Design a binder for these strands. Sequence first.
RNA 1: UUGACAUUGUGAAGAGACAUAGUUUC
RNA 2: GUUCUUUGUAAAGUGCCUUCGAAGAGUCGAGUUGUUUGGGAAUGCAGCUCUAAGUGGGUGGUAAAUUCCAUCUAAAGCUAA
RNA 3: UUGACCUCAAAUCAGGUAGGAGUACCCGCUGAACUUAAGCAUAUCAAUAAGCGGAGGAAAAGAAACCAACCGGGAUUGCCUUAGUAACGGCGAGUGAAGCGGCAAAAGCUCAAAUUUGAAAUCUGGUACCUUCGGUGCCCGAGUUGUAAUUUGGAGAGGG
Lengths: 193, 203, 99, 51, 148
Amino acid sequence: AISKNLPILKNHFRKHWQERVKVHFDQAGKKVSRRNARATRAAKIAPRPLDLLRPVVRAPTVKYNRKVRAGRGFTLAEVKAAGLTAAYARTIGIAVDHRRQNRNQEIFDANVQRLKEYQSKIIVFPRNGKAPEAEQVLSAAATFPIAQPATDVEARAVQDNGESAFRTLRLARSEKKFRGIREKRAREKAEAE
Amino acid sequence: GAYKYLEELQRKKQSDVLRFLQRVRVWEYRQKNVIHRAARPTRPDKARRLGYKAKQGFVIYRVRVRRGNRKRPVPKGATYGKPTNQGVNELKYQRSLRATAEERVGRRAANLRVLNSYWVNQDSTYKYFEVILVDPQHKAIRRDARYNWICDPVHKHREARGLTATGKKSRGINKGHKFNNTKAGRRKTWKRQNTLSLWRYRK
Amino acid sequence: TVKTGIAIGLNKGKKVTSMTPAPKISYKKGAASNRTKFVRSLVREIAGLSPYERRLIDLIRNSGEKRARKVAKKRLGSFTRAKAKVEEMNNIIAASRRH
Amino acid sequence: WRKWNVKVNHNEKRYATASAIAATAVASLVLARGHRVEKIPEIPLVVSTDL
Amino acid sequence: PSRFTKTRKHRGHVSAGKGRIGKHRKHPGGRGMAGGQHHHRINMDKYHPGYFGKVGMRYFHKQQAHFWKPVLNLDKLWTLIPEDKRDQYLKSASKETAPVIDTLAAGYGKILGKGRIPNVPVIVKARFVSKLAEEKIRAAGGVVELIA
RNA sequence: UUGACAUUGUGAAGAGACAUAGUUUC
RNA sequence: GUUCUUUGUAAAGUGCCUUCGAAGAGUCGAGUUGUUUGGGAAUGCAGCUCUAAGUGGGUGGUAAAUUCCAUCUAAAGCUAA
RNA sequence: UUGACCUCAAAUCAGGUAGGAGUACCCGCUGAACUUAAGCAUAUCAAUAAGCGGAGGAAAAGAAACCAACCGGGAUUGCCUUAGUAACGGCGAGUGAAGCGGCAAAAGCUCAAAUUUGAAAUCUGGUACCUUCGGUGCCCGAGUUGUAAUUUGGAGAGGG
Ligand SMILES: [Mg+2]
Ligand SMILES: [Mg+2]
Ligand SMILES: [Mg+2]
Ligand SMILES: [Mg+2]
Ligand SMILES: [Mg+2]
Ligand SMILES: [Mg+2]
Ligand SMILES: [Mg+2]
Ligand SMILES: [Mg+2]
Ligand SMILES: [Mg+2]
Ligand SMILES: [Mg+2]
Ligand SMILES: [Mg+2]
Ligand SMILES: [Mg+2]
Ligand SMILES: [Mg+2]
Ligand SMILES: [Mg+2]
Ligand SMILES: [Mg+2]
Ligand SMILES: [Mg+2]
Ligand SMILES: [Mg+2]
Ligand SMILES: [Mg+2]
Ligand SMILES: [Mg+2]
Ligand SMILES: [Mg+2]
Ligand SMILES: [Mg+2]
Ligand SMILES: [Mg+2]
Ligand SMILES: [Mg+2]
Ligand SMILES: [Mg+2]
Ligand SMILES: [Mg+2]
Ligand SMILES: [Mg+2]
Ligand SMILES: [Mg+2]
Ligand SMILES: [Mg+2]
Ligand SMILES: [Mg+2]
Ligand SMILES: [Mg+2]
Ligand SMILES: [Mg+2]
Ligand SMILES: [Mg+2]
Ligand SMILES: [Mg+2]
Ligand SMILES: [Mg+2]
Ligand SMILES: [Mg+2]
Ligand SMILES: [Mg+2]
Ligand SMILES: [Mg+2]
Ligand SMILES: [Mg+2]
Ligand SMILES: [Mg+2]
Ligand SMILES: [Mg+2]
Ligand SMILES: [Mg+2]
Ligand SMILES: [Mg+2]
Ligand SMILES: [Mg+2]
Ligand SMILES: [Mg+2]
Ligand SMILES: [Mg+2]
Ligand SMILES: [Mg+2]
Ligand SMILES: [Mg+2]
Ligand SMILES: [Mg+2]
Ligand SMILES: [Mg+2]
Ligand SMILES: [Mg+2]
Ligand SMILES: [Mg+2]
Ligand SMILES: [Mg+2]
Ligand SMILES: [Mg+2]
């Protein structure tokens, strides 16, 4: 059972794997089904849209923090700033998230601005039951898209202060590397009897 | 309130007053039947943070279960297979003694619904538990927005399915890296990572 | 903190105008409180000391504060708790049979 | 779990349909294909939007 | 399709192309990757030197991402500017108005120096650089601006 | 089968220490 | 959509000042045995022995002492897609 | 002598409830060997089959004692991916997950611990009447060893 110059494979089929094969014959069906659900929810949900206002949020980790992404809900802070309590904001098609925190002003403001636009671009019918039919826009998401913030300008003046990027990286990496040793030298000499 | 004092007093299980108390009670229970109706909680502060309430429809039951390992049944210790499986005697059982306790009373009061249960004592041979139960046909309960959930059929014998607090412990349902394996439910997630998924347009 | 604005080194990371959010009360799940202080004080003196706690203040007196931790560490979970346990008996000792 | 459907590159797919559209001109091809188009005015045969 | 398959061609011959002597049996080699260090060693060494044993250090719970850092060479670099916009900058190699290029924005982690950019100022914003890339960049009157 | 720990409590005499007051252990 | 009773000397929302701010125990945690896991000086589960605290507690995938920092808030509960 | 209370019993006592079946899917327990390793015991088959207890139209999970280490994210479930990877492994045969990203769907919450103390404000049942999935008056009873209102950490409470 080993022969030729072939790559070594790892095909995990030593269990009774044929008892666990899911072949999605129901792709087309579920799609239909899925679409019907949406038409139904739309109709049931009167003029409301099919989704809630979601906040901007900067994504986690070194890999994605370049990008900005729809968040879960809006932080008790952001809501307060946008001139409303959370209990109400929830009934007005706005998602609120008690566990997100604001450390970033640029994002915070973006989110407050998101809220002012929303508030101005919805209308909220009186509780009575007068119901002045108003036609549903289906997507809070499409109505208030989230764009990446422009971080500079296309062209600009070159300024070369002189001290190179590469060496700064190198040095920067270095200071960290020996930060503790240097401190141990600071301690050990502090005990200059 | 007196419940704060009770709670604190009970964390001193080797304090003098408490082990007199433990001593006398553990003889009394042991005298009574292995499952017997309790008249009232002997730990009302424990009962009540665990869902109990002093209204008709709420029931307490005291039960004791044998301690120690699970001796693997099997005639004469014979195992009839590989050596890894030849043990008999240091074998442990994946449910807690508390679960056994819950199950054995839930069976005894099948009109009732196990809600929760709590430890009250032990000696070398038994652990002693009180199980707090609810009667979902009692109107006092069937009303009561807060408790009448317990009346829906999805909650028949929660103790038999690992849905009481002990059960969720042993099933290992908790968020995190420590619970990857069991968490959405171990057999379920096994089945998942061991299902071959084929699309009409093969990916 | 302040981040340096480059991608390695000490305060590595993006410069952002900062905010520092209102404190969460979860985060104070540990805090004492007058009510607990009172009740715990009262219970303690109601119910006295446990066996190992007695063996403990003996060792403290008669063998020092280091052998005390070593035993208390084996008795309790671990070292940090033994730290606080010895520490506690130390203050039973001071407060009582002394000043 | 036999392979029932088949993936075709979207672009190769269009190459094909384009080729096919192109050939609905070319009377020889339309004739060879069955299709009784000797007595038709011209190919491509374009009729009024009124249809 | 079966139609074009050699087993159609073998119908009528006894052994199905598998020999009268050697036969087609279940598992003569053993199964799978068996025999590696024994009857299948000549094929493993040769074709697979390196297979058995260990090398360096284990790393528990390695999160690939930590090390996310695509490379872009000066080679390209100007491709990160859209071509219409691009021709405009080539002509007017210039301080005061040099193109900004956010390479991080383009999804690169490090700039490396494969070969010869034109002698035209660029302003290059990146997380890392090779010593060389920065050198070449500078020799065109440009700078690297370290971002994060 | 043998040991240790838990179930395990109460007196008394004799040993065992802060090193010839009694908390502790045999 | 319509119509009838006003549920109220009722119930709720929001700004400032001050003082407070109760938060789950034979559990957490520990040793050991066994099982299980990709989880490696130990991923989960369970038995026996030990057994907490309150500026505490858990986690931070290499054991330990020291000093920090980050992040949640266990040992009680319901819940459509 | 009479009346309570606690604990414990008895009725063919008033009214209810559990059992069994089904079991594709689901929540648990318990638990193999054939097999693979060209022998074989650890390993593998497999946390599989058989055995046992328990539900529903789904169940289970679920509003973080989470993930991270970011400019941070934000209940759960599933799909695409991560990845045949980190890792485990007579480091042999073999095995093998997670965080980020996109997407389906979206939804959030209540108890315990608090003196109503200028008024147990709460509830089962019997009974009469009614406009009966219920309401009201009345009477036994539950309940202070605590039934309502209020509060649930995102908070929140008391005075102003
Ligand atoms: Mg497979
Ligand atoms: Mg096999
Ligand atoms: Mg199917
Ligand atoms: Mg949607
Ligand atoms: Mg209306
Ligand atoms: Mg009763
Ligand atoms: Mg067997
Ligand atoms: Mg074994
Ligand atoms: Mg006994
Ligand atoms: Mg696993
Ligand atoms: Mg294919
Ligand atoms: Mg073929
Ligand atoms: Mg064919
Ligand atoms: Mg042919
Ligand atoms: Mg031939
Ligand atoms: Mg021939
Ligand atoms: Mg032939
Ligand atoms: Mg021939
Ligand atoms: Mg051949
Ligand atoms: Mg032959
Ligand atoms: Mg031969
Ligand atoms: Mg073959
Ligand atoms: Mg190998
Ligand atoms: Mg290149
Ligand atoms: Mg003996
Ligand atoms: Mg809690
Ligand atoms: Mg072990
Ligand atoms: Mg087992
Ligand atoms: Mg283990
Ligand atoms: Mg440590
Ligand atoms: Mg965070
Ligand atoms: Mg509850
Ligand atoms: Mg649930
Ligand atoms: Mg009857
Ligand atoms: Mg049944
Ligand atoms: Mg098994
Ligand atoms: Mg087979
Ligand atoms: Mg074999
Ligand atoms: Mg063979
Ligand atoms: Mg054999
Ligand atoms: Mg196994
Ligand atoms: Mg089975
Ligand atoms: Mg049914
Ligand atoms: Mg349902
Ligand atoms: Mg459904
Ligand atoms: Mg459910
Ligand atoms: Mg919470
Ligand atoms: Mg999540
Ligand atoms: Mg080897
Ligand atoms: Mg291999
Ligand atoms: Mg496995
Ligand atoms: Mg997502
Ligand atoms: Mg809800």
